[PDB]
A paper describes a structure:
In humans, ELAC2 carries out 3′ end processing of both nucleus-encoded (nu-tRNAs) and mitochondria-encoded (mt-tRNAs) tRNAs. ELAC2 is self-sufficient for processing of nu-tRNAs but requires TRMT10C and SDR5C1 to process most mt-tRNAs. The SDR5C1 tetramer forms a base to which TRMT10C is anchored through its ‘adapter helix’ and, together, they form a platform that binds the pre-tRNA substrate through interactions with all four tRNA subdomains. ELAC2 folds into two β-lactamase domains (N-terminal domain (NTD) and endonuclease domain), which form extensive interactions with the pre-tRNA through the acceptor stem, T-arm and 3′ trailer.
To determine the molecular basis of tRNA recognition and 3′ processing by ELAC2, we reconstituted RNase Z with either the canonical pre-mt-tRNAGln (mt-RNase ZGln) or the highly degenerated pre-mt-tRNATyr substrate (mt-RNase ZTyr) and a catalytically inactive variant of ELAC2 harboring an Asp550Asn substitution (ELAC2mut)59. The mt-RNase ZTyr complex was reconstituted by first incubating a 5′ leaderless pre-mt-tRNATyr substrate with TRMT10C–SDR5C1, followed by the addition of ELAC2mut. We then determined the structures of mt-RNase ZGln and mt-RNase ZTyr using single-particle cryo-EM at global resolutions of 3.4 and 3.2 Å, with the ELAC2 region at 4.0 and 3.6 Å after focused refinement, respectively. The structure of mt-RNase ZTyr reveals how TRMT10C and SDR5C1 facilitate processing of structurally degenerate mt-tRNAs. Overall, interactions between ELAC2 and pre-tRNATyr involve largely the same ribose phosphate interactions in the acceptor–T-arm minihelix and the 3′ trailer as observed in mt-RNase ZGln. However, the tRNA elbow structure that is recognized by ELAC2 in canonical tRNAs is absent in mt-tRNATyr, as no stable tertiary interactions are formed between the D-loop and T-loop. This results in a higher structural flexibility in the elbow region of pre-mt-tRNATyr compared to pre-mt-tRNAGln, with the D-loop and A56 and A57 at the tip of the T-loop poorly resolved in the EM density. The structure of mt-RNase ZTyr shows that TRMT10C–SDR5C1, in addition to its structural support for the overall tRNA fold, facilitates processing of such mt-tRNAs by stabilizing ELAC2 through direct protein–protein interactions with TRMT10C, which compensate for the loss of interactions between ELAC2 and the tRNA elbow. To better resolve the productive active-site conformation, we performed a three-dimensional (3D) variability analysis of mt-RNase ZTyr particles with respect to the ELAC2 conformational state. This resulted in a class where the pre-mt-tRNATyr adopts a ‘contracted’ conformation, allowing the RNA to be positioned in the ELAC2 active site.
Author numbering:
A (entry chain F): 92 to 156, 175 to 385
B (entry chain E): 54 to 189, 234 to 253, 297 to 401, 414 to 467, 479 to 792
C (entry chain A), D (entry chain B), F (entry chain C): 7 to 261
E (entry chain D): 7 to 207, 211 to 261
The structure:
RNA sequence: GGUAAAAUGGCUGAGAAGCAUUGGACUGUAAAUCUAAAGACAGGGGUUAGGCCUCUUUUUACCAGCUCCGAGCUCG
């Protein structure tokens, strides 16, 4: 199309536009109708090229650089040890559910961010001393989330020690032992219960539409809870919704006998001054 | 130069709203003809007042400066350092007169740019003021017309865009047609190629438009010139939320909640016209009123349908109409305080005249407003706070118009009010526009129980009031709200007694005076939570009003003057008995409806379930914060 | 050689117990399948041919095993080999502090009765059956082969009852071998690892795949044909007695 | 040191349990004697002082062990050590061809449930009590010590049920230690071998005298005080877990 | 099976290795005898047929084993099985208080060099030879079988050096199997008891034969060869010690 | 009690041997450190007081061990306990197909010449010294304690020479215990797991934390004071002989 | 319902950059590495020369307006 002409002319002006471009992202560019969307998309491409080029120079700068008990094969041993722990957790661990029913309310950017947060959350859960048993409920096959997950994990997807299913959490656990964590719940989480199942909505929701998780929970008459962020720290600025990795790390700290003043260490410091 | 500039019609000239524009720009904002109720309309449609630098008034008349005080106190609470007015030179005297009932309004700064003052230019627009004097210091024959010229914007090479000018013309009557036609300054822009005026806003009665001279005057501006006409011929709903609420409540009880009522382009609400980007009749936000959607939304409520079904399967004069049941600021659903009393089919009494009261009355009665104004016998003003008396001049002018239309003699109205109100109306009559020739005012102190006849004229006036309203006796007492704050009580020959408290606190003189009242109307500004604030602000809480009513032993109790904190409904404490009721805008209450009123509580709870739940949640959060403090 | 031998295989209607029956019948031996009546033992017996007879019996019951042995003696005339492949398992931790759960005594007792008690019952009755056999020219009267998973040496979490039963079998292997030495009966034990039997399929698929991948060589689940091959090797070899052979793949099971 | 510790000793009214109780009470600890009502444990509890109490219970029944643990918690408010020195023993060959005798299933069942099932019952019920203790500086919550004679490794003729029970105890030690590792409870096993308990004294005097000569060094029957010393050493050492220790004096049993 | 399969058998001139060679060649395999030049294994290699070749070598010497493996590669082209059946034995008490005699360090070291060091020396080279084989469809490249007597568990009086070497082999089995697992080589160990080797063959031998529970006789190298063949055939045996004993547990 | 005992500790200038010497001297015994001259054991002997004497000797050569024993007899007059806590560790694969690398024979030989041959040399020379002692009232003349490793049971990739040497000690601990039984000398073996010796604490922090997490309970590296405590318990107990004790924490080595 | 300020979806920034994350490597003890993936400062709009201007959402503060002149509780 004619978009390449304005691309080159803005590159001559250097108005925060990518140095080069590929065909597929170019078609995505003409699939942007607002000049603001095209400007934001071009800036995203521009910052991608800059960071990719900037990090390359670090390789060049690095290029300027008996009796033993064990061979230096530590990475394999850590991986195998985490695998054994995960295999045991898949049988005797406490279930934790990620609800993938929010695939409709997320745009492409929020979908990619959700996948990244899910990757980080699973990685943090694997390394723990007492991991959960992570469930991926309402994960429709060949869906957008499923396709992205199998793209990022590649062949590891078939070997991850977690249960992925197309069913719902209500179809796997008794309705009494299910607690749907959400920021809009009226009930305030007091203590971590080891006999309950906690559901975390795999949601990003940058274009804030609060109450989605609460509506989904109340539709099935499920119990709801909210973190006592307020009771333990001075909330200054920022929405009380937390990322998936922060939520799983808070739950892991609580699960391991930690107190609230220690579990809330993973809340970003830019949101609260300090504890009470 | 700014990148976008467009106009917007806040009010379309309808008899109940007046006319007003709203010039929006990236650098400045302007307003024209701030009439009564303009603040409420602009707040409802989310029109920001943060950077309202200038307000242009095209004529020194209450239809153009009615809501000026409300806008001034709002901009102040907004934090604007200075606001500049433009129009007739009489504004200075008007500003002096406003301070009589208000304070000195020290915070905000007021400036006046009369027509004789040098031209004013801004970062986005140059404004010229054209003084026009009708054929044949108070001046009743001056009208100011505005010609606004935009700044030339250099092109992006893109050719530059020359400034496009628009003209606002006010022609209140036929007497102004020739001065407009013979004006030389208009011929400078009209008969030329200089920036052919993009759009001309005409605010003149339709009888003026059909005149041949005026028709030729508009045609001489060129073929490309548009013409917008706000001429009381508009058919558009201005208060959408009020219509929604009234239609929804009408589904419960129809009687208690009655239903409301040369090329040229007739103005509509929220109609726009861009000038800087391009020149088009945008028309993207035009309000659309459809009762079917409103009743569908009401019926789909979780509990409304069963509640109204249960109420319905269960199954005269005087009648009270609550025109306005809100305290300080006009809001989306509740206007400022007012109460119409219909003693007889031929006589009526207005219990309080807030700002824009006539607008609510016109909306309530529709084409019957002229007949209603004929029956208006007296108006009672209780304490000189703003938004309790500012709507009086509109009522007086509309009463004169209705009497002229209906063919009745102009007999002066009877006003019972504190003597301090005399100074405000006296200054307005002397400096700005003749009013006093319409009222015969009676001081409120002269009607006290222990009062004495100050003058024989006062005794004659009060006797005339008793004859006209057919009342047996009229009494007033000093309630404990502010300096010179009065209640009232009316007793008819039939024997029923009505008592109006007014802004007050729990008082003993009111209880003593209003003993054995048939119906009591009491202030209910706050709830039990903020009794300390109520004492500090000299107001009564809900339980305080209920206790006052019970002690006085009234047959029924009604509450009004709800605070801005309250959005739609007040709380319904278990103390709510069969005698305690609640008030909403535009409901009609008769003496036979007292048993019905308690039965309406479940349907009203259902209709506002979400709002009351949100209010309860907010109160609980506030209580938790207070405890944790 | 195993030609002409008669074998009694407990649990020989599925898994490890069926592979040995298939191999022995194919080689030319006669087999008797000893399994619960609910299992489709009769279908496998019909499939294997005229040298296979299904005997519905319960190992935990003395009368049932006696009736099965009587049927085997009536049909074939002698008993030369006995293979104990019947065995159940349970997955339950001894005590779960966080969940406040305790291992039930009923589960432990049932696992102990099926795995350990039933094996001893079959051993002590089949030994009496072999005692009447005329001695082979090498002095051997019969062979008894047991099964005791590698959990006897390296238990996993939630594998207390299974490890206890298998460890009991392993510990009692040698005393029984010394007991039957005068009457010329050899007692041998096999310690299979992860062999992909219906017992192991109770675990989730991903756990099974990970466990298979962790075998040093070959990195796969065990094949019951390999178990049958080892069983035949034990029968043919006359000098294997009172020893536990781990058919594992060199896998050591982590906690 | 073991001062202030509270210990529950099953079978602590004679033999190795009584010796362990004597040594532990002597060092300043508190002991609870868990034995049968007719074992005469009340006399021993009275003799050992007010720091030792007797709780009549049967280890094979859940209710009796629960009542005994409740009594111990009421008296001392804490349980820190659980030592299992209980168990019957029988002696009969699996099959006696020359006499036509077959091992009875009742004797095997009785020895199995008293020795193996009772030990697991006590362990699972005690772990609930130890789980309520606050972890110490090292994170330890309690120590569980079991007994499993050397018959688990090298059994003799007639020790079929005994070897099965002891081998089951040995095999289940590692999975149980892995189960309670997150809790903070250490599990250990001891192989007493040949000791001067009344069980070994029930044999003919000549047989016992000959047996004491078969120990390489020291050439005498084991002293129960030595077993008590080993138990105390296991309690004191914080790094001993999931291991079987043979306190046999380098003896290896012959056919 | 073992048809067309090449095996390298250490100490094949006589003993358990000779019987293993006889059985393997009988079944259709190819054997390479690796023993001392004076052991007289050339006559046995000639007797067995054209599928047996005598390669004189000393297991303690790297050069001898390398030349023997080169000869095996030249003759047959590949190596698939390695059976380490060589070893010496010595009876001597650690200390005799009555006589004042002390076990000599040279005697102890000589046994370790042949039994333990020789086995590892053969293993580390035959594994390199086996690494060149194309993987079998089951993934297997070769099988290594070691011999370590039951002295590694219950040694007798005077068997200090012998038990040390055999226990070393038993302990070495598992880590070597883990080392060669990615390559695809199975390492297995056999623990023979009382066998009719030339070392063991009147009163003492008769009593020892009676001591075995069942069968009450000395072992048979034919049975040892049968067990070796079974280990070769079975694909799931790896990193384990098998005790071909007869249920005999030695006494002090 | 160990008051008055004289102990010879090989490799006692650092690691487990130093901790054993510190504990034994603290309880009132006397120790003779036996380690290479360049290990700086003279400073440790000076620190421990006049009750401890450094003997510069190499366990591989017979002459230095004899000289050290003569020095110990001259200084104190007798040898009652011998603790072998000296050894080198080497990690190297048997064969690396990708790199084309082979385990060199020199690395294998020098591990045996220290861990296995040196231990036996010290044992045989000390047993002569202990044979001159008058027998104790219990018939004992001395105690010899070796130090194997868990690598002798679960070797990892690369620990082929280490496991061969440590496996030899586990294999030979029983025949030696029978050899010295008439004299009255007890031989015992300890197999520590992951201990915080200086050779192992030099590893980076990340791998040290991983190794600490590997141990089930307590989830930390072993403390040499615990090894010294176990050595003292073995010395005091008269019925421990010819057995290997795993001081591990229930850690089974990962492959 | 209003008024004002702010908003980093892994965390801190700076206004570039660090600490992090995912897949792969059988590492000879700097793997303290190599390689592939993901890098969007609330969300929409516009324009724009950045940067502004606007709409929406969320977080945190805040929400009546009695004027006179002399008699000095009433008088205009
Ligand atoms: N403050 C908080 N308290 C409890 N759960 C929370 C939380 N913040 C996030 N979560 C959980 O983690 C998820 C992160 S996404 C949050 C957005 C969601 N639309 C909502 O506002 O409800 C949530 O869906 C919820 O499951
Ligand atoms: Zn008011
Ligand atoms: Zn008021």
């Amino acid at each position: 199309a004619a978009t390449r002409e304005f691309i080159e002319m803005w590159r001559l002006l250097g108005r925060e536009v990518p140095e080069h471009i590929t065909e597929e992202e170019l078609k995505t560019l003409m699939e942007c109708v607002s000049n603001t969307a095209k400007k934001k998309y071009l800036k995203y491409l521009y910052t991608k090229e800059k960071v990719k080029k900037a990090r390359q120079i670090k390789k060049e700068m690095k290029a300027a650089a008996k009796n033993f008990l064990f061979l230096r094969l530590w990475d394999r041993n850590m991986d195998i040890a985490m695998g054994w722990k995960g295999a045991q957790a898949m049988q005797f661990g406490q279930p934790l559910v990620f609800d993938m029913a929010y695939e409709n309310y997320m745009k492409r950017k929020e979908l990619q961010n959700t996948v990244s947060q899910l990757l980080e959350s699973e990685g943090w859960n694997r390394r723990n001393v007492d991991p959960f048993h992570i469930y991926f409920c309402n994960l429709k096959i060949d869906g957008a989330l499923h396709r992205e997950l199998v793209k990022r994990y590649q062949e590891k997807w078939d070997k991850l020690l977690l249960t992925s299913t197309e069913k719902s959490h209500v179809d796997l656990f008794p309705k009494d032992s299910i607690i749907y964590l959400t920021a809009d719940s009226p009930n305030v989480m007091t203590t971590f219960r080891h006999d309950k199942v906690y559901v975390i909505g795999s949601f990003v929701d940058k274009s804030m539409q609060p109450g989605t998780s609460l509506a989904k929970a109340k539709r099935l008459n499920l119990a709801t809870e909210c973190l006592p962020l307020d009771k333990y720290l001075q909330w200054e600025i920022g929405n009380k919704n937390l990322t998936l990795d922060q939520m799983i790390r808070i739950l892991l700290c609580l699960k391991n006998n930690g107190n609230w003043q220690e579990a809330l260490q993973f809340v970003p410091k830019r949101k609260h001054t300090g504890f009470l | 130069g700014p990148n976008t500039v467009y106009l917007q019609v806040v009010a379309a000239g309808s008899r109940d709203s007046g006319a007003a524009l709203y010039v929006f720009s990236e650098f400045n904002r302007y307003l024209f003809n701030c009439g009564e109720g303009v603040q409420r309309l602009m707040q409802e449609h989310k029109l920001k007042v943060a950077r309202l630098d200038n307000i242009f008034l095209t004529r020194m008349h209450w239809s153009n400066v009615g809501g000026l005080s409300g806008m001034i106190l709002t901009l102040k609470e907004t934090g604007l350092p200075k606001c500049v007015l433009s129009g007739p030179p009489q504004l200075e005297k008007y500003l002096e007169a406003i301070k009589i009932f208000s304070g000195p309004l020290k915070g905000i700064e007021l400036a006046v740019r009369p027509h004789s003052a040098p031209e004013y230019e801004d970062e986005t627009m140059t404004v010229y003021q054209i003084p026009i004097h009708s054929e044949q210091v108070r001046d009743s024959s001056l009208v100011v017309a505005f010609i606004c010229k935009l700044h030339l914007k250099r092109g992006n090479c893109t050719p530059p865009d020359p400034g496009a000018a628009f003209v606002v013309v006010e022609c209140p009557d036929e007497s102004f047609i020739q001065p407009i036609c013979e004006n030389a300054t208009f011929q400078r822009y009209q008969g030329k190629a200089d920036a052919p005026v993009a759009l001309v806003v005409h605010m003149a009665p339709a009888s003026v438009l059909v005149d041949s001279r005026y028709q030729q005057w508009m045609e001489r501006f060129g073929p490309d010139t548009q013409h917008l006409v706000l001429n009381e011929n508009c058919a558009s709903v201005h208060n959408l939320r009020s219509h929604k609420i009234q239609t929804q409540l009408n589904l419960i009880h129809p009687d208690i909640f009655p239903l409301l009522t040369v090329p040229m382009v007739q103005g509509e609400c929220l109609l726009k016209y861009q000038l800087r980007p391009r020149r088009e009749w945008q028309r993207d936000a035009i309000i659309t009123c459809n009762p079917e959607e409103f009743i569908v939304e009401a019926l789909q409520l979780p509990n409304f349908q069963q509640s109204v079904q249960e109420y319905r399967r269960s199954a005269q004069y005087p009648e009270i109409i609550f025109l306005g049941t809100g305290s300080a600021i006009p809001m989306k659903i509740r206007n400022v305080s007012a109460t119409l009393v219909n003693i007889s089919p031929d006589t009526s009494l207005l219990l309080d005249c807030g700002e824009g009261t006539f607008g609510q009355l016109c909306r309530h009665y529709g084409d019957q407003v002229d007949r209603v104004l004929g029956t208006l016998a007296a108006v009672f003003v209780s304490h000189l706070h703003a938004n309790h008396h500012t709507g009086l001049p509109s009522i007086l002018l509309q009463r004169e118009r209705a009497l002229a239309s209906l063919g009745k003699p102009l007999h002066p109205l009877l006003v019972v009010a504190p003597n301090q109100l005399k100074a405000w109306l006296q200054q307005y009559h002397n400096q700005c526009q003749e009013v006093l020739h319409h009222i015969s005012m009676i001081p409120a102190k002269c009607l006290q129980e222990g009062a004495e006849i100050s003058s024989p004229a006062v005794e004659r006036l009060i006797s005339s009031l008793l004859r006209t309203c057919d009342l047996e006796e009229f009494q007033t007492c000093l309630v404990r709200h502010c300096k010179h704050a009065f209640g009232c009580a009316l007793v008819h020959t039939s024997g029923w007694k009505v008592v109006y408290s007014g802004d007050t606190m729990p008082c003993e003189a009111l209880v003593r005076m209003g003993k054995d009242a048939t119906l009591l109307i009491h202030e209910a500004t706050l709830e039990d939570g903020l009794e300390e604030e109520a004492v500090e602000k000299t107001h009564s809480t809900t339980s305080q009003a209920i206790s006052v009513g019970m002690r006085m032993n009234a047959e029924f109790i009604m509450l009004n003057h709800f605070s801005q904190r309250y959005a739609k409904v007040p709380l319904f404490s278990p103390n709510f008995s069969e005698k305690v009721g609640v008030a909403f805008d535009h409901m009609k209450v008769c003496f036979g409806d007292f048993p019905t009123m308690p039965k309406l509580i479940p349907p009203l709870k259902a209709l506002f379930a979400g709002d009351i739940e949100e209010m309860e949640e907010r109160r609980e959060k506030r209580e938790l914060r207070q405890v944790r403090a | 050689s195993v030609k002409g031998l008669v074998a009694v295989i407990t649990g020989g209607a599925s898994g490890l117990g069926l592979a040995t029956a298939e191999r022995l019948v194919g080689q030319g031996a006669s087999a008797v399948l000893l399994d619960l009546p609910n299992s489709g033992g009769e279908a496998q017996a019909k499939k294997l041919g005229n040298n296979c007879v299904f005997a519905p019996a319960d190992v935990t019951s003395e009368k049932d095993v006696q009736t099965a042995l009587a049927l085997a003696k009536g049909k074939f005339g002698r008993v030369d080999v006995a293979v104990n492949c019947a065995g159940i398992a349970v997955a339950s931790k001894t005590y779960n502090l966080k969940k406040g759960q305790t291992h039930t005594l009923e589960d432990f007792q049932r696992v102990l009765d099926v795995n350990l008690m039933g094996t001893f019952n079959v051993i002590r009755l089949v030994a009496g059956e072999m005692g009447q056999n005329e001695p082979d020219q090498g002095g051997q009267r019969g062979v008894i082969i047991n099964t005791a998973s590698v959990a006897a040496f390296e238990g996993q979490v939630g594998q207390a009852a299974y490890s206890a039963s298998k460890g009991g079998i392993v510990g009692m292997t040698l005393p029984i071998a010394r007991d039957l030495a005068p009457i010329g009966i050899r007692v041998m034990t096999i310690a299979p690892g992860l062999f992909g039997t219906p017992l192991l399929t109770s675990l989730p698929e991903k756990v099974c795949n990970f466990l298979a991948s962790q075998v040093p060589f070959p990195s796969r689940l065990g094949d019951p044909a390999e178990y049958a091959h080892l069983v035949q090797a034990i029968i043919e070899n006359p000098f294997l007695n009172g020893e536990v052979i781990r058919l594992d793949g060199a896998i050591r099971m982590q906690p």
